[PDB]
């Protein structure tokens, strides 16, 4: 233990100290958040504490930037020495935090970069106020008033404007004070860069960072507690409407508005129920009954947020105006549809779904039915309501499903119903039995499978009982858009009758149905073999056309065609596979030479495996 | 009564019940010496050596179970203070504490402070069911008895409404560590009762089947009666049961057909009226697939048709017309007469009216 900056001497000193810290730990203890300053009675390391502190400080800082192992071991031993119960003063950990931050902003060397990240994160989990005061506040201060500037750490070395955002995303993931003050300051800077500056990507990144920090805490339910999330909401929400008022980038860009909706959903998801109601009432008064914004009278983009508001506000609390808002948004969708923008219409549809699954009972939906008008808006309303009904698992939804099948036999309206029929089966990301919340909705996970069992059979019978372009295309599109969201391996009995439409669904523009049907043939050929053996002479050139470059064959689509070609060649015996070697070897040349290279690598592998299977 | 002191000191001699009988005789003699012997035992197991502590604790638990006469609520809570400290310190003495818990849970001498301190700390320090065969065997007992004492909805939860939700995840805490079949049966029965007798399980449902599925592979009919106990497994039952129509091994297929039998029986008529079409599709697929599974699925079809008929004649009529529309060429022709004829044979064996329906629908065909 002698002062030295040489790589060998200092490295051996540090790796020796790595064992003396362990001996000291085993003899005495380790940190607790209550023992952050309490030292152990006596030892000889206290007499050497100044020397080890100095050698570590000169090993990390006042050292050349080319030291990867030296600085990594330096920050590691800094962190390990911090890990002792109150043996280093808050001044020492403050100096260590400053060293970590300076050496992480100066050097891009991802060794020292990520090692300093690890040290700062461990300090954050063992020292809330210390890291929040030295590192976090400084990092929040580096960013300037205007977007797209060079974050000048010092005279020469500078980091990007997004580097501060990335560092904020790194830690504060479990530090209550850090994360709350970070959310507040990021909201402040969002407001500032929208008001005194004119930026879009910075506002988007800031609101996305707010969303991510809210998510990292709602995953723990304790980093922001119920009351902590309520207080941070009361801090950020007026700061969010004041940036709503100015054009900003959250109103100018509807994507940042959706990020704000996610932030509101997360911060109202962690709200005490006794404080939900009034807030709900406020929302129930602000959006429906009164207020400047009226979702029931004039379409507006911010309405989408209210959807995430209603799924996040309490259900089993007095929400008297739930049927009237459903009727009002139905009327607005019927009337204002040409002047409704995409964000407005999507938000009102999500609001329809939220009421259907959460607040309004099934009687309101069934009383809202009107099948006499075969209009696009009417179909949208009925589909998005009976989607929550299916999510509620009732007769109507299942019987309305058959009604939809029948109406899908129509020429010009059955086609629209078939192309829109995906809506019934999708994920929600806002209304499921999420961890934490239990009053979210009338959630039923069995909706997908049930809907498939109610749809598939009739669809296939109709397809085999149909002649023309339109109605058969409708049946194929409907069954495909239903099977795409339901897991293919969870629907087994339907596979056998699905195989004809399964083979049919391999040629159509949407790569979504393409990936879905390719997955379904994968599962089928894994399970079924008689169908595969009897239908290989038909499937193989279809997979070949899938593997060909096309206006509809994405690079991923061609990759999946390669995967299915491999799977069907493995399952089908060698007799038919020998007859289908040269075609795959020849019609793949734009796939092992396309724009992406995973496509190229996997096409090379597909060609090689086909060649070795044919030659043997 | 010198018998008091001789028993209190000879329990260390590993006399087991021989000195316990003398303790009971002493309690009969002086009628006040039970508290004296338990408090003289309080520091008697305080010694660190294993024999002293374990033999004092086993007799303490035994005579505490044998002393429900004079036993106060706050004194009760104080009694489990040493139970918890022994749980915290070491094992191989915590087992006696486990029989003590499984003995004190049934009795009504469980205070509000006791039920709360239990539901918090019996898994705070002890983390029941995590270690050792018996030290994981008895926690299921103690939680079963604390459920069946007053937390079970025999008197509802007018003063134990706090433990409802948290009992869900404290039973989930004691899981994934018990492998002997007895603990498996215990977990199955606990899920069965904690869904059906207990209220407000819907707020925290579908997670109680996690321990069962982890313990699910024999003597497994307890899980099967659990998944059919209450309509709360409705959303759960189909969630697995339809998948079990696709199962390969016929034993689980038959057992799950029995479970669907009790399900259709005790899920009212609304759920069966909801799922009649998908269930008939799946069961006809299994008819083509197959106490075997075939008689079980015929009984499934029979009970499902009967449930629709008794619940709503409209639903049973929709079922009957769908079955006729799908199978009428089979009956009229000479193709697939066995399966379809057996299907309507089971259907018509429900009542006289359904039998007349089946006869008038099939006899004119052939």
Author numbering:
A (entry chain C): 414 to 1029
B (entry chain F): 9 to 225, 242 to 314, 338 to 413
What's written in the study?
Here we report cryo-EM structures of the HEAT-repeat protein Met18 from Saccharomyces cerevisiae, a key component of the CIA targeting complex (CTC) that identifies cytosolic and nuclear client proteins and delivers a mature iron-sulfur cluster. Met18 is a 118 kDa alpha solenoid protein comprised entirely of HEAT (Huntingtin, elongation factor 3 (EF3) repeats, protein phosphatase 1A, and the yeast kinase TOR1) repeats. ScMet18 has a curved S-shaped structure comprised of 23 HEAT-repeat (HR) units; each HR contains two α-helices that are connected by loops. We find that in the absence of other CTC proteins, Met18 adopts tetrameric and hexameric states.
To address the preferred orientation issues that we observed with the Vitrobot-prepared cryo-EM grids, we prepared grids of ScMet18 (SUMO-tag was cleaved) using a chameleon, a commercially available piezoelectric cryo-EM plunger that is based on the SpotitOn plunger developed by Carragher and co-workers. To our surprise, the data collected from the chameleon sample had tetramers present in addition to the hexamers observed in the Vitrobot dataset. The tetramer contains 2-fold symmetry and was refined to 12.77 Å. Both the hexamer and the tetramer have similar overall dimensions and their chains have similar curvatures, despite the fact that the tetramer contains two fewer chains. As a result, the tetramer is less tightly packed than the hexamer, especially around the more exposed N-termini, since its protomers are shifted away from one another as compared to their relative orientation in the hexamer. The protomers of the tetrameric state appear to be less tightly packed than protomers of ScMet18 in the hexameric state, and thus the ScMet18 tetrameric state may be more prone to issues of particle denaturation. Notably, residues that appeared to be involved in binding Cia2 (R1010, R1013, R1020) are buried in both the hexameric and tetrameric states of ScMet18, indicating that ScCia2 cannot bind to ScMet18 without disrupting these higher order oligomeric states. Similarly, the N-terminal residues whose substitution was shown above to impair association with client protein ScLeu1 (R144, K187, F217) are partially buried in the hexamer and in two of the chains of the tetramer. In the other two chains of the tetramer, these N-terminal residues are mostly exposed.
